[PDB]
Ligand binder design. Structure first.
Ligand code: MAN
Ligand code: MAN
Ligand code: MAN
Lengths: 50, 302, 246, 245, 300, 245, 301
């Protein structure tokens, strides 16, 4: 129904109340996703920082 | 002999105390205890008799935020400017603050994806590939490589900022500071808008209409050919535009997306901006967001 | 089990707690914390796979400018303690992971409380530096570091003096509508995270770029790298035109 | 169904007819006319959705300097009346829209008839102004407004009391060659108004923005509100950069 | 000695709502202007000697956006009040100001009101209305009426306070940045509308081609029982054609250059015809005629 | 099949070869070469569609300063000849395209060897110019033009005079490790010309427009004409804004 | 005694300038064409063979530029040579100086406008009608392109002849720098688009083949039977369910997840760097073919 949380690979839900973690990404695919998200939000930096 | 030069030992202990730049992390003025902790040996060496150590500490106890690893260049520049200010009156508590605030932003912006989002994930994956097989070599290599890279970067950048001190300053004193600030603000707004649109997830549950579609506007599964050509017919009508079900369901999310996608996200972001401008703590806003999530799920809104 | 192992585990948890905010030696990372706990508690090999899986999950979990990231240190220590307390060294890893991931509700807010309440420490630092005592600052910074380390030292010590199922049973005792509400509330904390920085920099001549960036974020054609490159190019063009006009 | 409901729907149709040429209170817009018709006829939620979808269709339907836009007020009123009369309150919205859209034959031409019949009204206004009769001028203006209102009121009153013999004429109009030809000709009559307003503003400096807007209007990823916001942002950026120079 | 109190200006502004309604092809909006100026003519003039002349001068051609016409009314009222006291009869200054700010103001008001504010408010209202919420139409009506009345009253007060001085304000200044930003935004939105709101879809068929035996799904050697479904779906996702006969349309070939090419070509033809001083009624009737004949010959 | 048709096809191939190097009348472009070949030997519309598809493929195939572009003229002429010879006037167009695309082997290398074979021609031209015999430099220039035409005229005649004959260029010329590698290497040879022309014009002021154009070229929603119009509009806006200072 | 280079000979030179290529070699590119175009001018201006050899050998050196924008250089050279013939102004370096001065920028402004701006639009417009079977497409393309080309050549040649020594002054910083800047902007935009779309370096290694949990694949073994099964599968796919139990991920997908066309721009930048190192494009093209063959051999491509 809902994904309670998603890590670098896969995501976490509850099945019949029990918590399960399902991995749906290869380690190199997880690294690619992490790099893509990190460098796709890098532009939001460089700011005054207060 | 009266120029109180900073020896290699003093710079080395400044770099060593740089490891603790965090630890006294605050919200009102983040990362001040680390700056003072790093500057303590410098003030101890190049200031004496305790008549004005309060002034130097207060100067080095203001707001300062940046990436923990790429902060050594700022420290080297500040050490050079302070040792030059011990004899030559150049920084009247207005140049060092200016250079600090100038390099806080862009240096953090370049250090965040390089270290947290490029080096760290690759090193973690390399270590975990060995760790998944029960090999201590994985974690050992991860630790050693990360420590070597981080310490080497800090020492290299600190030493470079010491030599280039009082030279780097008169490169941002020109038209390179306003330009960098303006470009950074433009790029930051452009990317923050996309981040707000994409990464803020607000999906609305309520369903408005469950109407029955008119005849000829949907795939009538009762009259489909018996196999073989049935799939051909179904796929060709689907490609034409016919619906897959007799009942057409309309959702509030569909209407809000027809207006413009991400409207709820931008409205929530503007509300958060207003609440922060009203001097409300971010902890309160985060707890409130969790509470309204729970309530919205309870009432069927989300 | 043995007492010396208990002090060793507590000390490892303290190191992980201080390095969860220090972020230098990565003693809080699962790859190191889980390995150390497995080494000091006996069974070491069975904890390396736990660290590997938790590090695979925990990539891209870094704090970015007052936007704290979940479960930096507490997840690894709690998972290792749970794994070693309940036996089944190689079979209990999935359960340890499924308990580690929802430990955000106990780690993120836990570090946020100490992070918020460190402000009076710096206020006292300023008051003591008003006279010029170096020892007071050198004492207060270390006390803050140790105080943040206690944040992970305490629950790890408490897990060793509690039944090896309590946290798991508690987590699966939730009304099952609380989890969905927490999940849909955790998808909006990035809103306040971005609101802080938007308030940090926002002027009359950069809001149109906000509008343009919001509009061009249409559904699934341009990647985030492409949007960042577009923003950089637009900023460069704007700067060039401003300089030429001036 | 009650006589009070008939009086109310006739009155709101008359108001929509007035506002079709007044263009001030927007009572002729579907978002208002359809909901007003539904409010006084019972079913209200079934007509608000119809008004919303018609307003989605009826965006960019402005009258620009003797270039009349199609189906100002008769489309909304006729669709709402047809929907309320025929049942299927929310299920019959596509049918109501499919009957309302081809009213360009009955919605665009008669307004031109009224506008060309208003010329003798202005001639008589000038004739009265020659003698200095102030009251006659306002009387003629009010009568012109009333005639414009009844131009829309009459078809609504015809629709309420259905002339079921009109089924003989529904398909009497020569199919394809007339009905579909007029239907496909009614989808391009907004081009005249768009061309006139583009002629109103055209300089060597704003044509590239026209090119940009035409290009970025590709198939269904950006809504009209997104395009409008993009245009506003681009205009603001251009003005700021012009001020910089 | 004529005062023209705020009540008279309020009455004129209220009557200016009916600037249309006497809309004729020979002299558009000429009756509404006189109707709105009726109370001012009544108050300023007497004994019916110059009332006829006053109505004559205000019954000539005057066409502009109904909402941005209050500045013209205010400047005209200021001129009339100025010439009523002191006998500064002009009979050409009033015409000069009426025609000077009749074209540019129409061109700055048509995009802002008809093509920027109205579609935005209509989309905002329709988003809620499609969900059955009464707040959609209510918000649309309230916001539109408030904006329109506020603009009308503020601009009427502006045009009367300034007076003949507005000729300086005409050479802006603010009126030049507004006329440029509005031009940019209007060109953007009008191009988008031309792309999206003009339907010239053709339907002739260029060719019917039998594809080679590597392109269609070949619904004769397909498996059965939910295996055929999977095979067909994977083949379609790969890129194989649904049917063995490939049909190519003229519309598809035209969209390969740029979508909406016919729409922009037709709108440029309409601009060229309009610049030739051709009435839009003839162009609209001709558009209906060409649509009919194109349907007859199979082009449309 | 007629002698006159064969002669005219060979002549058209010669003209395509000449304009392949001349690059002035564009007789080497598929839109013209394919249409002329089709007009000469019966089926004209069938070749017109094929020329249209090839022209859609052959956009951005220009030579830039010793960076030759693939299949300037040989692909079009060979595809037209194979289409007219093999029947299936319109149904065989995808097959003709699939055979024309990997003819880069026969096109690029065959024009490169001719281009390096013209150096002794220019040496003879210098030798003749040293004597002052200006009547021979023009003859050598015409001979070079004629050989550039012949390099494409000959393969067309070879294709015409052989329906299938001995298919060893269809069997052994494709070891299935060389034909596919060469096919995938032929899809990148335009990068050398693109890099050369980008090197020709590149400043820190125009690189952001390169970034914008690269980003805005996402997967299959804007056509190339739309992208070019966007570029022209952006250039005009930039020039107008820069002239304000 | 003035010769004056009558308009007929200028028309002949402009006509012969259509054959500026044809003797296109790798050593002195487009030089035989330059000499061939200059031949009538050498015939008229110079006589008795005592300096015809010198005039030819001076116009037989390196000359590389866009064929269409070469008439300005041709006219400037014509004016300079005509002026030198009557007045004793032997330079032998002023004409070479202006040739090298106009070699670079004119080629850089002519390549994108003609080959990459006018030609693709004209080809697309012609092919749209050609794809419909209408011969008006190719006819319009031919007529428009040739009219534009000949008009540009004649107008630019006449302008360049008129501004003999004033070419570098009447167009030095005015509508030359403006035309150069606009053409550079448009060319960079279109060339980035062409690099993204026209360069295909699609890799084909398989990163991983993972197995999905019982909430993702369509599960075509417990599907309903008959027409109901097709409906169920269709809406399950529309919901977002994976079509197969195995989720195959390739390197191309991961590369596109960053930004599409990454390999294309990387290869283009590598070619740029190689060209800047003074490596002839022939070696680069042959190397591209070699790496294509090898990459297919090792399975990388
Ligand atoms: O990016 C700014 C910087 O802020 C804080 O110091 C920490 O969260 C760092 O991890 C972060 O990089
Ligand atoms: O713009 C000219 C003006 O002409 C008429 O008065 C009406 O159609 C207005 O809507 C239009 O704005
Ligand atoms: O641009 C340099 C120029 O070099 C050669 O002469 C030809 O390839 C031309 O097409 C090219 O334009």
């Amino acid at each position: 129904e809902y994904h309670l949380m998603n890590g670098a690979n896969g995501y976490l839900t509850r099945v019949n109340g029990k918590y399960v973690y399902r991995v749906t990404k290869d380690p190199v695919s997880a690294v690619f996703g992490v790099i893509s998200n990190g460098w796709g939000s890098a532009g939001a930096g460089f700011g005054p920082q207060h | 002999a009266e120029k109180i030069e900073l020896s290699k030992r003093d710079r080395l202990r400044v770099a060593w105390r740089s490891t603790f730049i965090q630890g006294s992390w605050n919200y009102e003025r983040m990362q001040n205890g680390g700056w003072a902790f790093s500057m303590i040996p410098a003030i101890k060496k190049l200031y004496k008799t305790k008549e004005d150590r309060s002034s130097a500490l207060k100067r080095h106890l203001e707001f300062f935020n940046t990436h923990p690893y790429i902060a050594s260049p700022i420290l080297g520049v500040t050490l050079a400017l302070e040792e030059e200010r011990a004899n030559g009156a150049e920084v009247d508590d207005v140049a060092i603050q200016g250079v600090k605030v100038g390099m806080m932003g862009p240096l953090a912006g370049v250090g965040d994806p390089v270290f947290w989002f490029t080096i760290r994930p690759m090193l973690g994956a390399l270590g975990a590939s060995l760790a998944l097989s029960g090999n201590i070599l994985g974690p050992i290599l991860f630790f050693v490589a990360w420590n070597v890279i981080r310490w080497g970067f800090m020492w290299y950048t600190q030493e470079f900022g010491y030599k280039a001190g009082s030279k780097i300053t008169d490169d941002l004193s020109g038209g390179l500071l306003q330009d960098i600030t303006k470009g950074a603000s433009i790029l930051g707004m452009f990317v923050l808008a996309a981040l707000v649109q994409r990464w803020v997830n607000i999906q609305f549950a309520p369903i408005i209409s469950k109407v029955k579609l008119d005849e000829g506007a949907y795939i009538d599964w009762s009259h489909l050919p018996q196999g073989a050509q049935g799939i051909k017919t179904a796929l060709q009508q689907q490609q034409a535009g016919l619906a897959l079900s007799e009942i057409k369901v309309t959702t509030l999310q569909n209407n809000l997306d027809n207006l413009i996608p991400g409207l709820a996200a931008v409205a929530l972001t503007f509300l958060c901006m207003w609440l922060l401008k009203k001097k409300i703590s971010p902890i309160i806003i985060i707890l409130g967001l969790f509470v309204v999530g729970i309530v919205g799920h309870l009432i069927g809104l989300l | 089990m043995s007492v010396i192992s208990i002090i060793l585990v507590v000390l490892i948890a303290f190191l992980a707690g201080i390095e969860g905010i220090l972020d230098e030696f990565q003693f809080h990372q699962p790859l190191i914390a889980c390995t150390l706990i497995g080494l000091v508690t006996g069974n070491l090999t069975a904890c390396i796979i736990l660290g590997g899986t938790l590090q695979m999950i925990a990539l891209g979990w870094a704090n970015i400018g007052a936007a704290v990231a979940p479960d930096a240190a507490l997840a690894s220590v709690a998972s290792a303690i749970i794994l070693v307390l309940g036996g089944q060294g190689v079979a209990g890893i999935p359960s340890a992971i499924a308990i580690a991931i929802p430990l955000a509700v106990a780690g993120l807010f836990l570090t946020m409380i100490v992070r918020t309440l460190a402000v009076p420490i710096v206020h006292l630092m300023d008051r003591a530096a008003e006279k010029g005592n170096i020892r007071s600052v050198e004492w207060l910074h270390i006390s803050a570091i140790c105080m943040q380390g206690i944040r992970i030292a305490i629950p790890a010590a408490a897990l060793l003096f509690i039944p090896a199922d309590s946290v798991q049973s508690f987590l699966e005792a939730m009304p099952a509508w609380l989890t969905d509400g927490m999940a849909i509330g955790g998808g909006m904390v990035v809103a306040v995270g971005y609101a802080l920085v938007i308030n940090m920099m926002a002027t009359k001549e950069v809001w149109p770029f906000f509008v343009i960036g919001f509009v061009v974020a249409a559904i699934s054609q341009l990647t985030l790298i492409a949007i960042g490159a577009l923003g950089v190019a637009l900023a460069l063009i704007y700067l060039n035109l401003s300089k030429m006009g001036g």
